[PDB]
mmCIF file with all atom_site columns, C-alpha atoms in Angstrom:
data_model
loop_
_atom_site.group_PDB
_atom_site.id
_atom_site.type_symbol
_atom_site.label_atom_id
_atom_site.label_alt_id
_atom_site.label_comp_id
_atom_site.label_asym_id
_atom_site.label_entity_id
_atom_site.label_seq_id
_atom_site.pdbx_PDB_ins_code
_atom_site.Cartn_x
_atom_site.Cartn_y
_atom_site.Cartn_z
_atom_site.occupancy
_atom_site.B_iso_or_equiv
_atom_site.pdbx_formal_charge
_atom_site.auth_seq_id
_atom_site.auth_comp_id
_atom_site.auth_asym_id
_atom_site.auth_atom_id
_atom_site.pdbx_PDB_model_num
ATOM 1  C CA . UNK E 1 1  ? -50.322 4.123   19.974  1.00 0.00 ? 921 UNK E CA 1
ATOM 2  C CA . UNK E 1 2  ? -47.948 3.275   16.901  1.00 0.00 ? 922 UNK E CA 1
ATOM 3  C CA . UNK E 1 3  ? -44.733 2.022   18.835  1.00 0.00 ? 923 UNK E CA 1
ATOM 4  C CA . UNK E 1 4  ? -44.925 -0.949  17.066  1.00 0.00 ? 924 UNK E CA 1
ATOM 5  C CA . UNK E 1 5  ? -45.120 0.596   13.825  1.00 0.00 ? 925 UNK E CA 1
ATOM 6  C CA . UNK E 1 6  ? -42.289 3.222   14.792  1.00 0.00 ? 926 UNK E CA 1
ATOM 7  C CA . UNK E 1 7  ? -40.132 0.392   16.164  1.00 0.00 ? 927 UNK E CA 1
ATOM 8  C CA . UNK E 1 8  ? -40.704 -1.635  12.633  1.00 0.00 ? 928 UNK E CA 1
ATOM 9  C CA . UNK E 1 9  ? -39.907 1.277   10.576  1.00 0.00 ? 929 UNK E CA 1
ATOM 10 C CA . UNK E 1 10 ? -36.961 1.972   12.699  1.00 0.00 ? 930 UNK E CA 1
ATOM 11 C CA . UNK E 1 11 ? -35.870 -1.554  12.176  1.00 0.00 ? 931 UNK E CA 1
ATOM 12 C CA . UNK E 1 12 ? -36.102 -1.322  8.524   1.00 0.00 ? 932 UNK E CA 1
ATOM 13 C CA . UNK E 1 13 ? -34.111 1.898   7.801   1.00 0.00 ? 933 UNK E CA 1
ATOM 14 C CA . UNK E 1 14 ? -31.113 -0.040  10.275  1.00 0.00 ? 934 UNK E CA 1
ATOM 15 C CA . UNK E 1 15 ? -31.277 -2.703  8.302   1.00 0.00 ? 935 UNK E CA 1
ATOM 16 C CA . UNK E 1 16 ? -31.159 -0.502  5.112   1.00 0.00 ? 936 UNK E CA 1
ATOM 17 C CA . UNK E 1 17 ? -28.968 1.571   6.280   1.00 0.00 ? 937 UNK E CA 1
ATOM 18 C CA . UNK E 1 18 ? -26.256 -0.984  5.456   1.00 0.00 ? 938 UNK E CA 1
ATOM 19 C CA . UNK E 1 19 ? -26.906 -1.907  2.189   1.00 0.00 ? 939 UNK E CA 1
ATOM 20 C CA . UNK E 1 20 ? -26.436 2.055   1.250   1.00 0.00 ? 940 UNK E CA 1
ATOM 21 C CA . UNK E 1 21 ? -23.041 1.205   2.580   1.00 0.00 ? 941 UNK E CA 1
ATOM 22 C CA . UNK E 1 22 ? -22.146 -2.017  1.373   1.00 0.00 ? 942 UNK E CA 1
ATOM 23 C CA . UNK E 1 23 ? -23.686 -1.920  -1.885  1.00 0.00 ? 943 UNK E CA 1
ATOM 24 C CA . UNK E 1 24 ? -22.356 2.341   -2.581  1.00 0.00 ? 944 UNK E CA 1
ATOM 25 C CA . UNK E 1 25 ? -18.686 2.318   -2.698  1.00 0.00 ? 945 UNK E CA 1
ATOM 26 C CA . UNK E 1 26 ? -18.812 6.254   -2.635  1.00 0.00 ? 946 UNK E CA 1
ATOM 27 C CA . UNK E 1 27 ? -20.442 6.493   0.045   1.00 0.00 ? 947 UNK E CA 1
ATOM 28 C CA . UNK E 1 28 ? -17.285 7.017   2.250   1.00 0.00 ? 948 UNK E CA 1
ATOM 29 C CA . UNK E 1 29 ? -15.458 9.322   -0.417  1.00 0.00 ? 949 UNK E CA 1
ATOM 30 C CA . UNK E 1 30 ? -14.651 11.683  2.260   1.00 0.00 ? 950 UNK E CA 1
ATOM 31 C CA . UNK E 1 31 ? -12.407 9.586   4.968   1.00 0.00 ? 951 UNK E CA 1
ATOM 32 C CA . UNK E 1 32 ? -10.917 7.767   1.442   1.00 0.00 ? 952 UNK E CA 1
ATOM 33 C CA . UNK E 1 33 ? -10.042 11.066  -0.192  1.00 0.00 ? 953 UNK E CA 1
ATOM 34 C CA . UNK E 1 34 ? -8.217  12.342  2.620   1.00 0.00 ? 954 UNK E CA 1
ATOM 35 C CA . UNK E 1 35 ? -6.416  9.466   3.205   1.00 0.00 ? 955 UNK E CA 1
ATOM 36 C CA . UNK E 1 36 ? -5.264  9.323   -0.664  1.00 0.00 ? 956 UNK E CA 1
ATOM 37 C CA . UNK E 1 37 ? -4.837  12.862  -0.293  1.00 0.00 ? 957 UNK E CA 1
ATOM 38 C CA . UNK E 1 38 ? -2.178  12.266  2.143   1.00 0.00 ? 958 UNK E CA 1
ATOM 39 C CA . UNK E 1 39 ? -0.862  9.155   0.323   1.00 0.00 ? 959 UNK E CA 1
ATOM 40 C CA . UNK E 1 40 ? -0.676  11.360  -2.795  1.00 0.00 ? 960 UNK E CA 1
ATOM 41 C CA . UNK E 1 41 ? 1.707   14.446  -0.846  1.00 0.00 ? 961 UNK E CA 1
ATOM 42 C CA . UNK E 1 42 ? 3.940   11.498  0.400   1.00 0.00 ? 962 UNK E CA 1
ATOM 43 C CA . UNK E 1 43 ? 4.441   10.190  -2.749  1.00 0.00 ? 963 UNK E CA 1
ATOM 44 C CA . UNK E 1 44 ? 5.323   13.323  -4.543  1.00 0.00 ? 964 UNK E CA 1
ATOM 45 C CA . UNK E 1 45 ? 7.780   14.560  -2.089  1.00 0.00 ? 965 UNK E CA 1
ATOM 46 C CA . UNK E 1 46 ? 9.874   10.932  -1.565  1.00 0.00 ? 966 UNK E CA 1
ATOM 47 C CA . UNK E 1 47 ? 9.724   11.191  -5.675  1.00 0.00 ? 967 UNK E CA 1
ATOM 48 C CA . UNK E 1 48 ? 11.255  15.364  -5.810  1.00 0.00 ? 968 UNK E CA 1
ATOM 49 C CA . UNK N 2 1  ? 34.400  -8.109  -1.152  1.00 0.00 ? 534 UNK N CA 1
ATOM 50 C CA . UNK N 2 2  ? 31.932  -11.153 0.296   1.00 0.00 ? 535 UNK N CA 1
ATOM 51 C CA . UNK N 2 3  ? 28.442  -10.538 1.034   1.00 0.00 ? 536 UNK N CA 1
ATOM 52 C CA . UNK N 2 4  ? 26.850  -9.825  4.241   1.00 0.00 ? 537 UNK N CA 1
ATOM 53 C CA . UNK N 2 5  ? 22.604  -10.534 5.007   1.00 0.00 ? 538 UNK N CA 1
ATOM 54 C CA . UNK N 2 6  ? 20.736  -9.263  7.415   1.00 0.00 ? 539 UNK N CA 1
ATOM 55 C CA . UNK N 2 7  ? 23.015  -6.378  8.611   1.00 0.00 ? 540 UNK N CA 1
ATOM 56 C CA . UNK N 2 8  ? 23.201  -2.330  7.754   1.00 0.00 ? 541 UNK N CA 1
ATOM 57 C CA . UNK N 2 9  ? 25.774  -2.206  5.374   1.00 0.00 ? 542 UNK N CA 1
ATOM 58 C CA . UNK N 2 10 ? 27.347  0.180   2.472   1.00 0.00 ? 543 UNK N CA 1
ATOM 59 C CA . UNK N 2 11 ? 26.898  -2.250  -0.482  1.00 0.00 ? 544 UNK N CA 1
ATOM 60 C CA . UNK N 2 12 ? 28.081  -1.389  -4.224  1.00 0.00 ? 545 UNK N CA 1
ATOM 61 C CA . UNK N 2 13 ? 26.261  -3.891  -6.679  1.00 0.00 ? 546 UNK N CA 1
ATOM 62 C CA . UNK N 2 14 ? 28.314  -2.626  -9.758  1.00 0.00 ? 547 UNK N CA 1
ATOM 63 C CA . UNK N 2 15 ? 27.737  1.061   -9.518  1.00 0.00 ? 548 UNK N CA 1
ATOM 64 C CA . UNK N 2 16 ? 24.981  1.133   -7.505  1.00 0.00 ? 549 UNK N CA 1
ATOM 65 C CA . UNK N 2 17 ? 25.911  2.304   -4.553  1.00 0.00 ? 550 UNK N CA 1
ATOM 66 C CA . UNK N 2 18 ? 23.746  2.521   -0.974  1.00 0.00 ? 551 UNK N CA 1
ATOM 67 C CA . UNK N 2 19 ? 23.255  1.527   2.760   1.00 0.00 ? 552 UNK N CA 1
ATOM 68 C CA . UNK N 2 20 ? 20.517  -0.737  3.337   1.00 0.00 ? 553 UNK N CA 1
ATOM 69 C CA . UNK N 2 21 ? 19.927  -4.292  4.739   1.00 0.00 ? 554 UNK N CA 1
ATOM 70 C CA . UNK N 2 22 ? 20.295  -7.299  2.601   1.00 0.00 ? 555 UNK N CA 1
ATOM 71 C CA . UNK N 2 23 ? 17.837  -10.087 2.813   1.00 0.00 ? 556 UNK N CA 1
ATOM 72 C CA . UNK N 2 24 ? 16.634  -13.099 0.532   1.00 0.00 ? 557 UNK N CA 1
ATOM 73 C CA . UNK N 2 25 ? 14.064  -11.975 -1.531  1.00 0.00 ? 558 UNK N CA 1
ATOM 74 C CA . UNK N 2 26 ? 10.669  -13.831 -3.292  1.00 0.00 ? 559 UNK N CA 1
ATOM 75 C CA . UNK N 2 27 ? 10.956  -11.942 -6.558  1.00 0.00 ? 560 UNK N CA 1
ATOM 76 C CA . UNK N 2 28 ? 10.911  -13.757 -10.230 1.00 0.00 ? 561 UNK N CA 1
ATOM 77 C CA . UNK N 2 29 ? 13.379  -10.996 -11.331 1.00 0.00 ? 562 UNK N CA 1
ATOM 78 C CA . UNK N 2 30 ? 14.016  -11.660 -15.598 1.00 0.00 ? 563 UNK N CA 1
ATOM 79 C CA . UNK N 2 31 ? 17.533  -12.585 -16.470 1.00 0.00 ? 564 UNK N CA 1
ATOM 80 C CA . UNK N 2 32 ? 18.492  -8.950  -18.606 1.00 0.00 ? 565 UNK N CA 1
ATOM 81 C CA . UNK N 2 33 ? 17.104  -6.578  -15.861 1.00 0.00 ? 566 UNK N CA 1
ATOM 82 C CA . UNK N 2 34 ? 19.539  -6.620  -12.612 1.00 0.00 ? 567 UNK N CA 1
ATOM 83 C CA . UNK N 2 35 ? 17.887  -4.133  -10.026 1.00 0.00 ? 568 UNK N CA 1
ATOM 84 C CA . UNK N 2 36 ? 14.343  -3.369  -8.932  1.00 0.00 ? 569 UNK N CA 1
ATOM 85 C CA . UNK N 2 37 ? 12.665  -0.288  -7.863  1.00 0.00 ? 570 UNK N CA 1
ATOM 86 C CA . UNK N 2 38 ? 9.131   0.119   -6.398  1.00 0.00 ? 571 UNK N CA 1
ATOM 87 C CA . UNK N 2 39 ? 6.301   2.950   -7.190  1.00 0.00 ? 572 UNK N CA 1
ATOM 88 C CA . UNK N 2 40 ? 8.559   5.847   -5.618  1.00 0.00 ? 573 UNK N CA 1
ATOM 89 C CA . UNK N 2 41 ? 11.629  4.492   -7.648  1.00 0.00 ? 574 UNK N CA 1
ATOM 90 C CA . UNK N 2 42 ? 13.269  3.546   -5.280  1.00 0.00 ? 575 UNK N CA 1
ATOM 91 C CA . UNK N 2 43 ? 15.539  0.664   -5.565  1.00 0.00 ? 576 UNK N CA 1
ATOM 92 C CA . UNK N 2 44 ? 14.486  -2.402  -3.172  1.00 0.00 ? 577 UNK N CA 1
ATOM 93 C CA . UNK N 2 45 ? 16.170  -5.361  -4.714  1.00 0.00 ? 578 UNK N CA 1
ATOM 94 C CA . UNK N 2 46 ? 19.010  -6.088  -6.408  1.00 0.00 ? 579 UNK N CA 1
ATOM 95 C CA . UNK N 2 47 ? 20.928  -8.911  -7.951  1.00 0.00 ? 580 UNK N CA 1
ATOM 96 C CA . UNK N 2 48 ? 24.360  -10.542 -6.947  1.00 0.00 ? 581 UNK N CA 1
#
């Protein structure tokens, strides 16, 4: 009786969905920390 | 002893000594510094 509504809603939170994404730049702290994590160990043991 | 580009070759640019493989390079080097080294310090370019 509310697919419409449900389907609406739906669409909204999509569509909201990526401006938590490309507005935040922390969002995706965890995938970037372990990459600079692994950056980071490189670079220390090429500089011992 | 003449130079040699673009082959793997033990090259002594006046005391600093290395294998590596010499190409032309882009960089605006200054005239008193002579060799370059990156974030690792590493060196990456030198001068003739």
């Amino acid at each position: 009786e509310n697919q419409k509504l449900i389907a609406n809603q739906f669409n909204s939170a999509i569509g909201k969905i990526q401006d938590s994404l490309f507005s935040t730049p922390s969002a995706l702290g965890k995938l970037q920390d372990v990459v600079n994590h692994n950056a980071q160990a490189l670079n220390t043991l090429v500089k011992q | 002893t003449n130079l040699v580009k673009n082959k793997c070759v033990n090259f002594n640019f006046n005391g600093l000594t290395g294998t590596g493989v010499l190409t032309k390079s882009n960089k605006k080097f200054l005239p008193f510094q002579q060799f370059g080294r990156d974030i690792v310090d590493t060196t990456d370019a030198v001068r003739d």
